[PDB]
Ligand binder design. Structure first.
Ligand SMILES: Cc1n[nH]c(-c2nc3cc(C(C)C)ccc3[nH]2)c1C(=O)NC1CCN(C)CC1
Length: 261
């Protein structure tokens, strides 16, 4: 009634590889993430996962260790990665991007309300269930940034360069929440344009300098309608203190635009 055949490999998490596992008896499907502690940073992932319960967060069912092998038992999302819904050079229909973005923000508000920062928000880590509902996955790089109501600044560089905020390259210490916001902005750009705007947010990238100089007649920006673009102007702001926060994202005109049946 509860041993699982590992039916196929789904890919790799930040730590370990994920398999689709099917219950021989009940036919129930879960994802099993398999982490070779040999061939602590994983302990934290398990710890963080036990705090989480939200409809836009990949459910954690339990863990079992067998030798040097940690298994984490996670919600299977049969829709796969948001990454695979993004057409290269094209993006996806604006109403689809909006609903995904709304679902992203719900999950991120949730994390940040319990004091957790994800730190590697990108389409490969955003999963779709059978109803195309988005779930945030993979807490391998996640960390506590608020505890007993006191914030701590982050100092370690974590994340994926095209998605990372510029302060994380430029400051010894920085606030966790505007990092996650920025990376949500790069995801929205990807969804609406089917391309990433720069290799990293450095003045050393021409495309990044072009964005700061507001050359929005260039790609990817010219593919994006004026209303979402105006949101991206407020998310992709280099100084993290002047960057829009989630409460204000939720007030944004595109965010609230009716689009989708
Ligand atoms: C925890 C989880 N639940 N469901 C899926 C999943 N369901 C999936 C369903 C499919 C379908 C299209 C067969 C494909 C991948 C899927 N992943 C995963 C998972 O971690 N996938 C990782 C995410 C990172 N990637 C870098 C590698 C893969």
């Amino acid at each position: 009634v509860e041993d699982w055949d590992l039916v196929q490999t789904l890919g790799e998490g930040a730590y370990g590889e994920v398999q689709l596992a099917v219950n021989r008896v009940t036919e129930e499907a879960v994802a099993v993430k398999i982490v070779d502690m040999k061939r602590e940073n994983i302990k934290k992932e398990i710890c963080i996962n036990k705090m989480l319960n939200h409809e836009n967060v990949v459910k954690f069912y339990g863990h079992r260790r067998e030798g040097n092998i940690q298994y984490l038992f996670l919600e299977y999302c049969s829709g796969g990665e948001l990454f695979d819904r993004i057409e290269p050079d094209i993006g996806m229909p604006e109403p689809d991007a909006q609903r995904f973005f709304h679902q992203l923000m719900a999950g991120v508000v949730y994390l940040h309300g319990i004091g957790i920062t994800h730190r590697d928000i990108k389409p490969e880590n955003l999963l779709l269930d059978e109803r195309d509902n988005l779930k945030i996955s993979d807490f391998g790089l996640a960390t506590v940034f608020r505890y007993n109501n006191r914030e701590r600044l982050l100092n370690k560089m974590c994340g994926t360069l095209p998605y990372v905020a510029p302060e994380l390259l430029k400051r010894r210490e920085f606030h966790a929440e505007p990092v996650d916001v920025w990376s949500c902005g790069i995801v929205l750009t990807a969804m609406l344009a089917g391309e990433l705007p720069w290799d990293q947010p450095s003045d050393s990238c021409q495309e990044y300098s072009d964005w700061k100089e507001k050359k929005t007649y260039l790609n990817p920006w010219k593919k994006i309608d004026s209303a979402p673009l105006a949101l991206l102007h407020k998310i992709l702001v280099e100084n993290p203190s002047a960057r829009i926060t989630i409460p204000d994202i939720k007030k944004d005109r595109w965010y609230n635009k009716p689009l989708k049946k």
